[PDB]
Write a protein that binds this ligand. Structure first.
Ligand SMILES: N[C@@H](Cc1c[nH]c2ccccc12)C(=O)O
Ligand SMILES: N[C@@H](Cc1c[nH]c2ccccc12)C(=O)O
Ligand SMILES: [Fe+2]
Ligand SMILES: [Fe+2]
Ligand code: NI
Ligand code: NI
Ligand code: NI
Ligand code: NI
Ligand code: NI
Lengths: 237, 233
């Protein structure tokens, strides 16, 4: 229908806005050392394990016989493994520092990482009463934002991986490629689905919110970078 | 109506109070440092509870009478996370560790129910009218008073033995938590049939999620029997 085609087109329009945010200009700027462009990496601590939990406990319904939910379960199973990759690159980048337990807690629950820490919370709340087809729209919008972020972060990440001869897993092309997926992708199923008028309206609200919340997270990354521009990652060769 | 909902909260409290974790915590034949082995588990909850109170309960864009008094109470409850960080240091649990060891601790599969308690309350609360939010908050505060009445027993024993001011596992926390109140307003309120059935669901959920957290605290103590508090004189 024109319903589903309007939804997928809205995700494209939001993606095109989202790709142009200042953070991503900065992350992509090869005239700044990759070490300085990845100074935002530790901020991901407020999101990456929350995302694991979103996939394990909010998206997944192991019991459902529903066609759409079974496809979600398969995809979420894989997407919930990426937090280990985050902790891998956290160490390689020199950001796995020894600190007091309270300093780690005060960092994650920083007022400067509120939108970062609440992105998966907001998605869980949006998703609580959605039928599987509508969760698929949530996941497609959220994955579209994710691919923009990690396509950008993989640029300095692959520069450091090549130079230090270390295998990066999270800020790395392998993450982008595995995430994109190539049994069927959600975007294939969505292209074969028609939405009611209510569903079409709910899908608009979903795409708008997922992109607004993702932009709020990126906003906090930009302000963290501004506060740390004299600092850099310290990868070991 | 309400009377039935206030009576279920007291029934749930009397059941909750009997959990094996609370018998362990109140056992004065066990050193208080051993009974507060569970204290660092509170890291997965205390700052989430701050956020629940700042962001999920509170609505700074409402004019409703019930929502106004909620906002007031959530203001005070949102300050106790600093007391948690105070007592963490006093008990010798503010350990130097890798950032990743802190993250792997809070996001432990053994603290799933502890970490998801506030999340579960936010999902439960997000579409509730304010009177029903008051029911969530009253049940939650009833469960919290059982826990902190028990924790303050070994807390105040260490506080006196070491002459340090404890703030979280301490009588002062139990006293300000308790001290117009929400219960006053609920006693004077008439629940429709539909609100009555939902208030029942809220009170059952708040106490089941709280029991699940307490279960994880008990399993933690058994899996870390060495890692007793190390307060200093
Ligand atoms: N790929 C990310 C998850 C992710 C999906 N969508 C996002 C949007 C914003 C930030 C992160 C994400 C990870 O493995 O952790
Ligand atoms: N008083 C607790 C909060 C609390 C209320 N109800 C609870 C139930 C379980 C655990 C904690 C709580 C604090 O300041 O952190
Ligand atoms: Fe990922
Ligand atoms: Fe409290
Ligand atoms: Ni996938
Ligand atoms: Ni392939
Ligand atoms: Ni109060
Ligand atoms: Ni809702
Ligand atoms: Ni352990």
């Amino acid at each position: 229908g024109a319903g589903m085609k309007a939804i997928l087109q809205l995700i494209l329009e939001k993606r095109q806005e989202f790709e142009k945010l200042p953070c991503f200009e900065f992350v992509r700027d090869e005239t700044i050392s990759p070490e300085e462009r990845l100074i935002l990496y530790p901020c991901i601590a407020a999101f990456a394990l929350n995302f694991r939990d979103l996939n394990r406990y909010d998206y997944r319904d192991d019991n459902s016989s529903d066609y759409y939910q079974k496809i979600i379960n398969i995809h979420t199973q894989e997407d919930a493994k990426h937090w280990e990759w985050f902790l891998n690159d956290l160490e390689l980048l020199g950001f796995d520092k020894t600190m007091r337990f309270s300093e780690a807690l005060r960092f994650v629950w920083s007022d400067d990482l509120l939108h970062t820490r609440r992105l998966c919370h907001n998605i869980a709340v949006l998703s609580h009463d959605l039928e599987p087809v509508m969760k698929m729209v949530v996941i497609e919008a959220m994955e579209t934002a994710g691919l923009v972020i990690f396509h950008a972060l993989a640029k300095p990440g692959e520069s450091i991986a090549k130079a230090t001869r270390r295998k990066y897993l999270y800020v790395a092309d392998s993450h982008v490629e595995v995430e994109t997926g190539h049994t069927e992708n959600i975007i294939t199923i969505l292209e074969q689905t028609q939405l009611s008028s209510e569903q079409e309206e709910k899908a608009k609200e979903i795409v708008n919110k997922v992109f607004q919340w993702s932009t709020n997270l990126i906003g906090e990354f930009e302000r963290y970078v501004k506060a740390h521009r004299s600092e850099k990652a310290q990868p070991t060769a």
